[PDB]
Amino acid sequence: PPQSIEAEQAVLGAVFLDPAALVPASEILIPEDFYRAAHQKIFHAMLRVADRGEPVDLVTVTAELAASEQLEEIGGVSYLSELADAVPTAANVEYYARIVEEKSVLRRLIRTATSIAQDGYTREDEIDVLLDEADRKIMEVSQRAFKNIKDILVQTYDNIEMLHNRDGEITGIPTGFTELDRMTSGFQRSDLIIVAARPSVGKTAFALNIAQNVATKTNENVAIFSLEMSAQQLVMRMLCAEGNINAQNLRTGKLTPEDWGKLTMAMGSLSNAGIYIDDTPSIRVSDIRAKCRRLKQESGLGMIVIDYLQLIQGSGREVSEISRSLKALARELEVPVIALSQLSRSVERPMMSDIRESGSIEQDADIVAFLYKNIIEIIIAKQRNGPVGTVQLAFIKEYNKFVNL
Template identity: 35%
Template sequence: MDQLLSRIPPQDINMEESVLSAIFINPKGIEEIEDLTPDDFYKSSNKKIFQAILDLKKRRDPIDLMTVTTELTKKEEIESIGGVAYLVYIADTAPVATNISAYATRIIELSKARELISTAAGIVEKGFNVKNIDQYISDSQAKILDIQTTASKDKFSTMEEIMTESLKRIEQAQKSEFKLGLNFGMPKLDNYMQVWGSKLILLAGRPGMGKSSMAFSIAVHLGFQGDMSGILSIEMDKEQFADKTLSVKADINSMVFYARDSINSYGYQRLTDAAAILSDLPIYIDDSECNIEDVKRKCRKLKKLGCKIIIIDQLNQISYDKGLTPYIGISKNCSALKMLTKELRMPILLLCQLNRNLETRSNKRPIKADLAETGRLEQDADMILFLHREGYYDKKVDESITEINLSKNRQGETGVERQVLFNKKRGMFQMGGING
């Protein structure tokens, strides 16, 4: 590693001097490179010169050879940069950047490369004395993800660009045989929800309502429509998902799957046929434990794989920093996932478990106030779906009857879906795709 760090870091002194020279010739050029900072320069002299230029700009003073010399002299830095001779060289001799914006972008990229090399070296050094491997991996991921170019953070759009994109979406929706966005297989609510873009959709309910089963049923339904989904299943493992979907598609109770000699040849054939059909569904599943940084990393990877939606099961199971209360930890993770939807420009269906206080009420249907007891979730959610099966509490009521309450919808109507039934024997919900 010492040999690696002894190499000259990525840099381009000529390019740095060219940018400074361009500013001396045309001070207005600095308006084109507002993302560039003094720390992005590799050569110490160039850092100081650029800082002097920024100080003059901040005071709205003229920027030229004389004023920069005076500014550096006042800071007692004129000698450390190589004296007036170096400034004269930059102003009169150094090659001028013909495209100052492109040069500045390259200087920033080289700066980030140096930062990444330094960060990676620190990660390697700590790795020789690691005590908590999970914390070490999490901290390492966070440090690397923090190294982003300013350009990737600041993405301004003009009104013309926004309006053009909006009209394209509207025109596409008007001409399309199908509605814009994804279809969850909920006959009523699909007409209200616009599942596309940077949407955070909460699917909340008490344990036993079937949140995981609902999420998996939605993924399978989407798969039969050709829409790829990614599932981060922290709550339910992939083997359970496989058994549930096979059970429904083959119409065989999964309870007999692992009981010796309980499936005849006809049943095996149905299972084989069902597995062949389900194998073609565009679904990716990861069932490992993770913290919020793991979740963000995996979501970025799922986006690259082509997923149109990511399902996270569930919010309460994502670990958070030690020392935080569950309320604060869950709230911070939810806010981070909302920001992630904006970064990825894709919807996330986030499952959330409500606390048991609602079960003390005579009417056990969840309401938005129940979310407030779990964390600050309502503010971040674009849509909130509450899952409720009255038959779970009242044995006189058919347990297959399901209520899906669209309690919040930023861009449309709210309402209650009662046309989706729960198949208790199969552990899945009866939605269009899985029965198709």
């Protein structure tokens, strides 16, 4: 007999606790969904209160139950008390709701199905009607969250301010890029930041520039994981970008004697930085976590940068569990985690669907950023606390740098 009292108890209790939980509850349940008579009565009464008035808590609900002389018929008020206990988290009210809701469609399936079985013995008699009401009866379960301007333009306005409100205190870790710092404020502790771009756009360079800007300017330590590029190959790029040395000039070396003197200043400045690199070919996330874990508690950590996610291997011998783990990583170490990502060939201006075909990073990330005249565009398509828009920066190919505007 399919049911989840366990779950029911939560929903009912979860209302008592919030009680802004009772809205998402009703949008998903109606009394009958509840298998236990006693509960049926409560959710109903609970709802009958919402219709005032007035609002909804212990007293107001026992009131409505004695009102329809069905208080001592539930249990005692002692059971309304109890209920408030066996709800783990009030914020998960809707998931507990759907538990109850699923067991309530089931029941009706089973029922209407058995009602067909039951029919194929009494009628005999009809046939073509039977086979018609057979569909009907089942299809009548298939039937048994739509979204209306009125709010979409409340945000699509409040947003259309924030871009201009900014001002201006950098609460998190400053980027070095003054225009990005306005929007983000900047990259904050516990946030999973995902930067996505198609090959040759320059996401790597962009990650590095931030890493560099954070380690040299601020006192914080950066942890870079480069799964594609080797440690020396990577340093060569941020030496170029620091002291302004022509990249191809080092590659083909070549070197102007004073461009040579330009290198020695770059090294110095960069030696004092707190940059730690791991160039391991393909790491699992557990390895990323245990290395960052040690470093925080031994020298102090402030930023983790991973050169492209789709290169991280899983716990086997999926990309979602990686995503999910990276957000957890961020939460545990109280440090912004910048994970670079690559875009699907759907673009060929990027949007959310271009990583959604390669999800489910979209949810876990509390900030998603795309990259798109040697000028580049930084589109911030998702931010949990803050505005959404486009910041612009200029890219210099010769040094492999992003500079302000």
